[PDB]
Write an enzyme that holds these catalytic residues in place. Structure first.
Site, PDB file in Angstrom:
ATOM      1  N   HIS A 178       0.805  -1.216   0.000  1.00  0.00           N
ATOM      2  CA  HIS A 178       0.000   0.000   0.000  1.00  0.00           C
ATOM      3  C   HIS A 178       0.846   1.279   0.000  1.00  0.00           C
ATOM      4  CE1 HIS A 178      -0.035  -0.268   4.636  1.00  0.00           C
ATOM      5  NE2 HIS A 178       0.303   0.989   4.408  1.00  0.00           N
ATOM      6  N   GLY A 182       2.728   5.575   9.855  1.00  0.00           N
ATOM      7  CA  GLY A 182       4.112   5.509   9.455  1.00  0.00           C
ATOM      8  C   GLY A 182       4.836   4.262   9.920  1.00  0.00           C
ATOM      9  N   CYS A 218       3.942   1.190   9.241  1.00  0.00           N
ATOM     10  CA  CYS A 218       3.751   0.068   8.330  1.00  0.00           C
ATOM     11  C   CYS A 218       5.085  -0.398   7.774  1.00  0.00           C
ATOM     12  CB  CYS A 218       2.814   0.438   7.195  1.00  0.00           C
ATOM     13  SG  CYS A 218       1.239   1.054   7.809  1.00  0.00           S
TER      14      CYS A 218
HETATM   15  C1  SQ2 Z   1      -4.792   0.053   2.908  1.00  0.00           C
HETATM   16  C2  SQ2 Z   1      -4.732   0.994   4.105  1.00  0.00           C
HETATM   17  C3  SQ2 Z   1      -5.492   0.455   5.309  1.00  0.00           C
HETATM   18  C4  SQ2 Z   1      -5.441   1.431   6.468  1.00  0.00           C
HETATM   19  N1  SQ2 Z   1      -4.056   1.809   6.790  1.00  0.00           N
HETATM   20  C5  SQ2 Z   1      -3.575   1.696   8.039  1.00  0.00           C
HETATM   21  O1  SQ2 Z   1      -4.295   1.369   8.971  1.00  0.00           O
HETATM   22  C6  SQ2 Z   1      -2.117   2.042   8.298  1.00  0.00           C
HETATM   23  N2  SQ2 Z   1      -1.829   1.968   9.711  1.00  0.00           N
HETATM   24  N3  SQ2 Z   1      -1.262   0.850  10.238  1.00  0.00           N
HETATM   25  N4  SQ2 Z   1      -1.114   1.025  11.521  1.00  0.00           N
HETATM   26  C7  SQ2 Z   1      -1.601   2.271  11.845  1.00  0.00           C
HETATM   27  C8  SQ2 Z   1      -1.676   2.929  13.081  1.00  0.00           C
HETATM   28  C9  SQ2 Z   1      -2.223   4.177  13.080  1.00  0.00           C
HETATM   29  C10 SQ2 Z   1      -2.692   4.782  11.913  1.00  0.00           C
HETATM   30  C11 SQ2 Z   1      -2.626   4.158  10.695  1.00  0.00           C
HETATM   31  C12 SQ2 Z   1      -2.057   2.885  10.690  1.00  0.00           C
HETATM   32  C13 SQ2 Z   1      -3.264   2.292   5.654  1.00  0.00           C
HETATM   33  C14 SQ2 Z   1      -3.300   1.272   4.537  1.00  0.00           C
END
Ligand code: SQ2
Ligand code: SQ2
EC number: 3.4.19.12
Lengths: 305, 305
Positions: free
Chosen positions: B41, B143, B145
């Protein structure tokens, strides 16, 4: 979101760990520039342990008696000195993996990460607090002596703890990196009073703020209190007294959440007086005091090193 | 003695973390040999997030669109491929800090350490469990990920998790290192059912054994039970069913303590039925299920890496 009992990344410290052997005894050392630091009780035998005469024991030792091994590499010892309860072994090679570092004597109630090591090799890393009575509640087996505690700010490792001793009560005692024990303790195999411990009030409040930031909402109430009224309750429950200095360091968390510090104190008062009623906060069924206000902001804002 | 929620030393993994940027989006990557792994993503925009067509989005990208930075060094991208939900970016340089490693898909109820990273830099390390419903209860900000979970055996890092998503419920979802999600989840910004979670029974029992080894004695009772009787209780309290395979992996802890597994089950039964009565076990006022039997033996025996 989410809140975890998070340790500092340990890589910078892993590269400083060595094994130190003197006679029969093997423990861990910390290799920084051209000096290795380790607990002085590496020079004892079991005869010695009840009250070692460390000056006399060290006089029987020479540089070549201290075997220092970094992985499979042997270090050459060219001098030795005892500073308080630590030994400083000068070696002929500076550690190429030395990070930027400082030695810091921390205050009770502050937190740090411990890299538990055996035979100079890392086993695990965990976060803990220096208790108000200058013990730590660690996880240490025989052979872990010389493992260190530390904090990291940017690229600088602040070493604050070297492990020396498990008291008969099962709690742990150690020194700063100048060899001065935290607390009243001495490096002898004896029963030693630690004295009354208390809960770190400012840390509990920081963690309640962490809980609000992450969505645990249920303990917030319609009440407020005063610093006097709160501290009367703190005393009854063996909590540290709260000062304006503590209220000040909680300022950033109060501003982020909009919850005044004395309003949070009133929530904590109700939790102390009434308990949790079987419910949980951030996965815990007790009031957690091993996160400082700095820890909470760091973890809630993603500071890196 | 002492028992802590201990993570693996993170140094071997810290040396593999990089930053990956594609357009507006920056996240973490894992640099092993001459391949960088990261969540696919990274190629999305906020228009895309509700249901990205990842094949179409990736076709608009070329090698030179993926900016990969290891510290201050820029890596040259010479190929790219999408495998399930991960991107694999071939780079022209093998990571000199690559540890011995394997990719492992773990089972629900197993534990691992997470190195939380932002912009390719490590922030903290903590231990957690893969829940029976294939979520994890982590600590992740935007951030994070591409941060990874791992175990270490001797000198070999087994990577088992890459972080992708926080569900609207505040729990976390991710993939193995072949890009296959754990659980039913998809990489889209949508509400997604995780389904009923349970407590990991074999881990609770392991932790009760850890408690006995460390001196928490008070929950041991005069009772025993059967696997059927126990599992009727487990069902009522949303605990995973206990099998003979679980009894077998608890064998070493039973032998060390002398407490038969079904006797420990009877202690756990009484704790489930009666609660803790305000008391604690290993510093916890709830039953802890994030230590496997392997974890307990490792920490109680000082295994290093
Ligand atoms: C496809 C799309 C799904 C939703 N998404 C996420 O949730 C990314 N992410 N992951 N851990 C998080 C902790 C706090 C905020 C955002 C966070 C981005 C990618
Ligand atoms: C002077 C003398 C005092 C007593 N002592 C220790 O307690 C060493 N030690 N430290 N942590 C431990 C955990 C388990 C067992 C032993 C442990 C050795 C040095």
């Amino acid at each position: 979101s989410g809140f975890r009992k998070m340790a500092f990344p340990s890589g910078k410290v892993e590269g400083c760990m060595v094994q130190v052997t003197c006679g029969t005894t093997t423990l861990n050392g910390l290799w920084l520039d051209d000096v290795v630091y380790c607990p002085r009780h590496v020079i004892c035998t079991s005869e010695d342990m009840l009250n070692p005469n460390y000056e006399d024991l060290l006089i029987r030792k020479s540089n070549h008696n201290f075997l220092v091994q970094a992985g499979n590499v042997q270090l050459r010892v060219i001098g030795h000195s005892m500073q308080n309860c630590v030994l400083k072994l000068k070696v002929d090679t500076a550690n190429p993996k030395t990070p930027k570092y400082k030695f810091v004597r921390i205050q009770p109630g502050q937190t740090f990460s411990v890299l538990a090591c055996y035979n100079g090799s890392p086993s695990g890393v965990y976060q803990c607090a220096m208790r108000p009575n200058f013990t730590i509640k660690g996880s240490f087996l025989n052979g872990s002596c010389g493992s260190v505690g530390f904090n990291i700010d940017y690229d600088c490792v602040s070493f604050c703890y070297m492990h020396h001793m498990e008291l008969p009560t099962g709690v742990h005692a150690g020194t700063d990196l100048e060899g001065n024990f935290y607390g009243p303790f001495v490096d002898r195999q004896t029963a030693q009073a630690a004295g009354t411990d208390t809960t770190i009030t400012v840390n509990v409040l920081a963690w309640l703020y962490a809980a609000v930031i992450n969505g645990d909402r249920w303990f917030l109430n319609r009440f407020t209190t005063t610093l006097n009224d709160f501290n009367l309750v703190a005393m009854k429950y063996n909590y540290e007294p709260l000062t304006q200095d503590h209220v000040d360091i909680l300022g950033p968390l109060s501003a982020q959440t909009g919850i005044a510090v004395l309003d949070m104190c009133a929530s904590l008062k109700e939790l102390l007086q009434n308990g949790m009623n079987g419910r949980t906060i951030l996965g815990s069924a007790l009031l957690e005091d091993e996160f400082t206000p700095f820890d909470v902001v760091r973890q809630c804002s993603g500071v890196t090193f």
